[PDB]
Amino acid sequence: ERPTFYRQELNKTIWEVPERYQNLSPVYGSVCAAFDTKTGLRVAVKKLSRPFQSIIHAKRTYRELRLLKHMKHENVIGLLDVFTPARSLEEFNDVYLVTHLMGADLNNIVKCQKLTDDHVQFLIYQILRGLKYIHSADIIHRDLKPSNLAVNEDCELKILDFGLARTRWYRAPEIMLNWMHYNQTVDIWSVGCIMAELLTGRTLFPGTDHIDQLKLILRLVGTPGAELLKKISSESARNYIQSLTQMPKMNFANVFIGANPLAVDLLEKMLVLDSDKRITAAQALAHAYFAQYHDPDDEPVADPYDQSFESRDLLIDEWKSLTYDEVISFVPP
Ligand SMILES: CCNC(=O)c1cn2ncnc(Nc3cc(C(=O)NOC)ccc3C)c2c1C
């Protein structure tokens, strides 16, 4: 039961999409905003770039599609559709993924603007809820930031681009210097930088380079204590820390002047150097800063997700064909 595609040489790249998708307006892939005719609903259409013209892209293509098909949560971007103009696995070299189009990202909401505590509470609460879900399926975002967080006019939020990362202002210090083995709280640190910027209106750690980034982070969290350093195996990481000039951790109360007391408590719990001791998503959800929204019975986790392919070393065409299977087997929500 195929459909009828049309061609749009607009962008500097050719778009070949189904009839229902009209008024393509451009906005690892090029994305267009478009108007779905079948639903009168505005969507986001993504054309994957050279999905199968390199082994890394091939695997990433398969990875992104599996994740989108499996993830069903109100705070995690969902897949409306996936298609290709190709009529056979031999013709397949293009992949399109369609999503809901939201009104704005977080990069603009705080665009030189301070929010209200309730606004912040609600935004951060949804990130944590969507994060708990993703983390439960054993997926980590890795590059969470204002731009991949999509919000609509009613402040309802969805997480974008998770699990692909397998733009320095939101990365955990341990994932930046490559020291102490990282865990899921790497996303918790990003949330910290985002929640802070949401309350203050300014970028928490607005670095100008890798080295200068660690500077700012350490200016606030203070240099790693003996407890942390003793757990750091990397010699190169140890040489760097031991070479820095000692610095005390600041009191977040005298940093986040005026913010709701509990906000500062949650913050302090999120912006910790010790990944071992950083609060988790599920744990941050139970925090009192969220008593108005917290609901232990409406904070779902993900059904088991088979990721074994991650340990696969296949050929481009093997990845290509597996994707083709995911494409044709797709059924809309
Ligand atoms: C607030 C205004 N902006 C938007 O609505 C908006 C802006 N973009 N930009 C890029 N991609 C978007 N969606 C998307 C995300 C993934 C994905 O997340 N796969 O990675 C696991 C896959 C395909 C698509 C189409 C997107 C949306 C929905």
Among residues 37, 62, 27, the alpha carbon closest in space to that of 323 is found at 62
If you measure from the C-alpha of residue 78 to the centroid of ligand 1, how many angstroms do you get, rounded to a whole number? 9
* Resolution, angstroms, 1 dp: 2.4
In the structure encoding, which two tokens stand for residue 225, read together? 């204590």
CB atoms within 10 A of CB 72: 14
Q: Which residues are catalytic?
A: 161
Q: Is 255 in the pocket of ligand 1 (CB under 6 A)?
A: no
Q: Is 47 in the pocket of ligand 1 (CB under 6 A)?
A: no
If you measure from the C-alpha of residue 99 to the centroid of ligand 1, how many angstroms do you get, rounded to a whole number? 6
CB atoms within 10 A of CB 216: 16
- Test site for ligand 1: of 72, 77, 80, most ligand atoms within 8 A of the Cβ: 77
Element (H, E) at 45: strand 42-48
Backbone angles phi, psi at 15, to 5 degrees: -115, 130
Left (φ > 0), alpha (ψ -120 to 50) or beta: where does 40 sit?
left
DSSP code, position 76: B
In the structure encoding, which two tokens stand for residue 251, read together? 């009191």
| Contact predicate 221/272, CB 8 Å | yes
If you measure from the C-alpha of residue 163 to the centroid of ligand 1, how many angstroms do you get, rounded to a whole number? 13
Q: Is 99 in the pocket of ligand 1 (CB under 6 A)?
A: yes
Among residues 147, 129, 137, 155, the alpha carbon closest in space to that of 76 is found at 129
The CATH number given to 1-103+302-331 is 3.30.200.20
CB atoms within 10 A of CB 203: 16
The CATH number given to 104-301 is 1.10.510.10
Q: Where are the domains of the chain?
A: 1-103+302-331, 104-301
CB atoms within 10 A of CB 41: 12
> DSSP letters along 255-296, please?
TSTTS-HHHHHHHHHHS-S-GGGSPPHHHHHTSGGGTTT--T
Specify the 3-state DSSP secondary structure of 36. strand
Across 297-317, b (16+ Cβ under 10 Å) vs e yields eebeebeeeeeeeeeeeeebe
If you measure from the C-alpha of residue 98 to the centroid of ligand 1, how many angstroms do you get, rounded to a whole number? 8
Q: Is 46 in the pocket of ligand 1 (CB under 6 A)?
A: yes
> DSSP letters along 141-187, please?
-SS--GGGEEE-TT--EEE-STT-----TT--HHHHS--S---TTHH
The Cα 57–Cα 79 span in angstroms is: 20
Q: Is 134 in the pocket of ligand 1 (CB under 6 A)?
A: no
| Contact predicate 22/283, CB 8 Å | no
